[PDB]
Design a protein around this ligand. Structure first.
Ligand SMILES: CC1(C)CCN(Cc2ccc(C(=O)NC[C@]3(O)CCCN(c4cc(NCc5ccccc5)ncn4)C3)c(O)c2)CC1
Length: 202
């Protein structure tokens, strides 16, 4: 249901079974790679998220860094995906120049597959993004274009997004979103039923 939708919530506690199935899931988690930042999930919390109910056939896009390069592979496998690709984003300035043992010129995004997705435009884009580091901790807007060309029109879901990530054809989840904005009638129905007083607790 085309326009941007979102739910401000604690992704640990949302009953995501109300949301339906998605052709693409994207996640950019607050990994515990530093227990400092306000919203960090522990490794068990990451592992224990109910990603498996969100899709039957389609793709998962999982931003990873540091030791989450390993842990995200683990979660991806535990959640029932095979990792079939890996996108890297080469971070440049506005003049197209690049930005422990080595300085880091790129972010990594894992691509996992579940089931047998049919009718996707595999092979349209290459596994390398080149884009300007806009704000810190922002992901490049180009990922949505690649995902839309890969699976045009389909329903998509982002976990741990921020208000700037809300997109048409996407439902965005995070705890710094402005309230709850839903328009897909099926989703609105199930949300009112699961959450008749609009609170998302426990
Ligand atoms: C360079 C990259 C392409 C790759 C790496 N990237 C790192 C990055 C940076 C920033 C964020 C971020 O700012 N995300 C929005 C949050 O709001 C922030 C706080 C948490 N967060 C929750 C957390 C949540 N439950 C857990 C909870 C625990 C304790 C207290 C309250 C909640 N439920 C719902 N959202 C999500 C982000 O996701 C990943 C950057 C881009």
């Amino acid at each position: 249901l085309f326009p941007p939708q979102w739910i401000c919530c604690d992704i640990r506690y949302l009953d995501v079974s109300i949301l339906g199935k998605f052709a693409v899931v994207m996640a950019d988690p607050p990994w515990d790679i530093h227990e400092l930042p306000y919203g960090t999930l522990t490794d068990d919390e990451m592992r224990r998220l109910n990603i498996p109910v969100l899709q039957d056939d389609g793709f998962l896009f999982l931003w990873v860094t540091g030791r989450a390069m390993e842990l995200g592979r683990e979660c991806l496998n535990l959640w029932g995906y095979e990792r079939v690709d890996e996108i890297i984003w080469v971070k440049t300035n506005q003049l197209q120049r690049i930005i422990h043992w080595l300085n880091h010129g790129k972010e990594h995004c894992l691509v996992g597959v579940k089931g047998n997705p049919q009718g996707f435009n595999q092979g349209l884009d290459c596994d390398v993004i080149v884009a300007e580091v806009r704000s810190t901790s922002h992901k490049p807007d180009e990922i949505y274009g690649m995902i839309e060309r890969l699976s045009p029109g389909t329903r998509k879901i982002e976990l741990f997004g921020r208000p700037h990530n809300v997109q048409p054809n996407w439902i965005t989840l995070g705890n710094q979103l402005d309230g709850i904005h839903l328009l897909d009638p099926d989703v609105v129905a199930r949300f009112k039923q699961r959450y008749p007083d609009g609170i998302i607790s426990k």
